[PDB]
């Protein structure tokens, strides 16, 4: 029993974190085999932040202009290239701690663990979600760029996010590990702003299913809904539309609990109408949307209470 914002154990990622310095600029890099991945804006100077030409900035660098430090060891850089908005520094040592890994680009609504780092060293680990507006609500300070987000289902690390920058409202933007930004953002300090964000409906339904698995039913009601009518109501509260794909994804939780998906949608409609009237659900007084259906099955018992 219980239900927590549960991250993956961070050791397999800790073993890949290094510091990368170019000029007077430093951030974190990810050392996998003989490549160090890091945001390309490490090659900017304070003159290059609104309209850098990264091809031009990079052609001016040699291998030995990149200082890569793995704990007390300086790694030797023997090649460098850029792929979209990440640099790839080839080094002459394969990381002995490289885990089994893959790169994955995720969709909005997906969750992942973040290992926040400064100067190549870990500060802490927390759970995040990719918001519908392609930002993440992280906790990041200057020097955190190159920190990564990941999952570790089944002993393979899937790296899905690398941190680049903070937007004016204090949320965060970055790329996959191929250097392609999530959302319409660019690695320029020119004015950019998160779009209007919405609530991740399929994840709120997942978490209501978690509440039932753990023993609580107070929020259910006797009604059902069509998918159409549900979406017409939920979008009046800035919820994302629920698709038939989402309905399909919730099938296993619906089966474990005996509550049809569209009946849980009816419950959610009433919760949005009523609030919780002084109650809590899994320890919260708001409807939580950063747990996916897969996260709920990962964390909860297979036997409902």
């Amino acid at each position: 029993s219980g239900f927590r914002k549960m991250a993956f154990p961070s050791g397999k990622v800790e073993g890949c974190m290094v510091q990368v310095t170019c000029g007077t600029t430093t951030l974190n890099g990810l050392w996998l085999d003989d490549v160090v991945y890091c945001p390309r804006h490490v090659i900017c100077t304070s003159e290059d932040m609104l309209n850098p030409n990264y091809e031009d900035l990079l052609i001016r660098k040699s291998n030995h202009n990149f200082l890569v430090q793995a704990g007390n060891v300086q790694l030797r850089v023997i090649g460098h290239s850029m792929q979209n908005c990440v640099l790839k520094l080839k080094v002459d040592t394969a990381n002995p701690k490289t885990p089994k890994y893959k790169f994955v680009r995720i969709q909005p609504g997906q969750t992942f663990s973040v290992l926040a780092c400064y100067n190549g060293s870990p500060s802490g680990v927390y759970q995040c979600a990719m918001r519908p507006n392609f930002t993440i609500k992280g906790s990041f300070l200057n020097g955190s760029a190159g920190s990564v987000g990941f999952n570790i289902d089944y002993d393979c690390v899937s790296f899905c996010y690398m941190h680049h920058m903070e937007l004016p409202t204090g949320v965060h933007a970055g790329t996959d590990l191929e250097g392609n930004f999530y959302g319409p953002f660019v690695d320029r300090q020119t004015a950019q702003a998160a779009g209007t964000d919405t609530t991740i409906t399929v994840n709120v339904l997942a978490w209501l299913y978690a509440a039932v698995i753990n023993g609580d039913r107070w929020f259910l009601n006797r009604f059902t809904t069509t998918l159409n009518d549900f979406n017409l109501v939920a979008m009046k509260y800035n919820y994302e539309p629920l698709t038939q794909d989402h309905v399909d994804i919730l099938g296993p939780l619906s089966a474990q609990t005996g509550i049809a998906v569209l009946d849980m949608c009816a419950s959610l409609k009433e919760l949005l109408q009523n609030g919780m009237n002084g109650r809590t659900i899994l320890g919260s007084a708001l409807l939580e949307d950063e747990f996916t259906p897969f996260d709920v099955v990962r964390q909860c018992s297979g036997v409902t209470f």
Binding site: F140, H164, E166, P168
Partner: peptide
Amino acid sequence: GVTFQSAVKR
């Protein structure tokens, strides 16, 4: 505004 979250080298 938009802030790259590198840091200045110590």
